Design a protein around this ligand. Structure first.
Ligand SMILES: [Cl-]
Ligand SMILES: [Zn+2]
Lengths: 102, 149, 151, 150, 102, 98
């Protein structure tokens, strides 16, 4: 009673409908009545990989900016320096600001 | 069976702002229409009654200032109805202004409003916004709905 | 006629925080109404005991002239209270916004909406109280107050 | 009590933000559960149907100027559902950014959203937020609820 | 023909018309509304050009030096003082538009 | 007739349940089905007196800051200057300028 990834369940108790490539997807076996909508990369991001019937789009912040757990909506400019009394152990990534220690 | 409600979401006249007409109504689990229908971005009433009407519109923009004038934005969400009258009638408005600071790198402004209104069969309700070009049409972000109370 | 709901809107004419809005409009078919509830001194009065989804939108709209500089920082708070069989009003909901701290700020547009479900007894009174009442825009479509029976 | 609704208030996985799990359920007159129940901060559905789901989250903070960064905060409220699918599904998001001015002494940002969603029996709904450390959990300030519409 | 004339709306009584209250509400067209439309109030940033009548809503206009464009319907904005570097002022500002630069 | 301060009414028409100290309270005789929740002092305030079953917490702005009728949410920093200063700032008021 589960549809495979790339498909969802229909009105007809035993049928599966395939997701529309570029529109929606499903990553696991399921019984959803609709596929999950694809994520769009925003103007502050670049697309690493497109949406497929089995994987959502993968976006990444544009160089010099990042997105982390507490700033999931908009890419933020990487911090210039470390706070008062701290060094700079790690450089910023598209998924993290600069790492500061001490 | 006899449920009167709708929730429609974004897809990527004498009324103020510009009518949002790109709503989607058929994704099971995300959006639906039950005893109401959509036409040109307007929800159409079938059963006369009191409806709690609501809408959320997401203004999202990256915008670095341009060395001259001010980039002050008025983000207004309007909810109108077309009835047995030539002009659309404003039911609700909700407004926000962007951050005046010149240090502002971007703006995230979700606007939600709702309320109860008496509507007649074949009354049409729509959403109109200022700065339509700054609206993010993600399905979880911008939406429009109503239900019979 | 067996419908329990109300939507009352703005009109230009105790131990509770802020100042009670008492200038609401009840009739005017299509824009405001009262069905099995009534208004008294800006308070909605309950007739039928039950669960009510209560909501309110209050529009803070103002032009501001920075001079000398501070203190132009505004706390815009909407409070929704109930009066029951108890001497003091009981806070049900609060929603707050602060104005823009930028000295470049020419004006402010701050609509505040909140809603929630509450169990109310017959003759319980519900009202809206706000800070900076003098910055409230009472246009009918902008500021309003209402409730409907859910259970 | 054939009424299907809940209003729960603040108490002092692949999902974005952090799940609020400290909701208060039964102070008569303030919060309640009627034909729904709470489990690990998630409201659990009993009756299949259309639910108007809503939440208000209060971001309240005193701010001290970040020396080497901007005082910019992204305050996002997410409403998710867990169904018969391994990952949580986003139903609604509402975002706000704090004042960019370096003259900013504090921030008061209440975020409210609501909408109608079809849910199956045993579907779970929860609230997730960014900057959970800035959330004010006063009962009247932060809350979560739903009621059967259809 | 079941339509009430401008300056009036339909009554509770299926065949009757009620007149709008001057200064309070109006109706600009033949209709079957159950209430007249509320008159607009000019806000502190505006000046009243003409008052509300039972047939015409109030007419407001931004105060001199300020304007309201299609994307700034809520508050009158101060007109820009000058054009950016290398642009000339083709049009002066109006209560309905900022300065035009080309 | 009424439940005393520090208590609230129970399902049984004539019974009173005591409030939980530090959790809730009631300041007057009543017939509420639950006690009122205690107020928490926020990071900008100092607690003058704790919540008891009969009194809600009493908070006050931290020295140097104040709160008034139009600023009930957050304590505001007292103004440094004015006009001359007729009165000093209090936890309930900014400086008075003459
Ligand atoms: Cl701001
Ligand atoms: Zn700002």
């Amino acid at each position: 009673e589960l549809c495979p990834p790339g498909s969802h369940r229909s009105e007809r108790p035993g049928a599966c409908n395939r997701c529309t490539e570029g529109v929606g997807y499903t990553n696991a076996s399921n019984n959803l009545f609709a596929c999950l909508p694809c994520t769009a990369c925003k103007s502050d991001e670049e697309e690493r990989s497109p949406c497929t019937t089995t994987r959502n789009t993968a976006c990444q912040c544009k160089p010099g900016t990042f997105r982390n757990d507490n700033s999931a909506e908009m890419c933020r400019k990487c911090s210039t320096g470390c706070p008062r009394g701290m060094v700079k152990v790690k450089d910023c990534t598209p998924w993290s600001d600069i790492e500061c220690v001490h | 069976p006899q449920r009167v409600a709708a929730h429609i979401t974004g897809t990527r006249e004498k009324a103020l702002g510009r009518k949002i007409n790109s709503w989607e109504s058929s994704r099971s689990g995300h959006s639906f229409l039950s005893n109401l229908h959509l036409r040109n971005g307007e929800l159409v009433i079938h059963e006369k009654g009191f409806y709690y009407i609501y809408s959320q519109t997401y203004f999202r923009f990256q915008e670095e200032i341009k060395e001259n004038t001010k980039n002050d934005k008025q983000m207004v969400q309007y909810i109108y109805k077309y009835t047995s009258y030539p002009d659309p009638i404003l039911l609700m408005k909700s407004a926000r202004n962007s951050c005046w600071s010149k240090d502002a790198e971007y703006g995230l402004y979700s606007i939600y409003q709702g309320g109860i209104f008496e509507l007649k069969e074949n009354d049409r309700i729509f959403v109109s916004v200022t700065n339509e070009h700054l609206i993010d049409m993600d399905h979880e972000a911008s939406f429009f709905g109503a239900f019979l109370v």
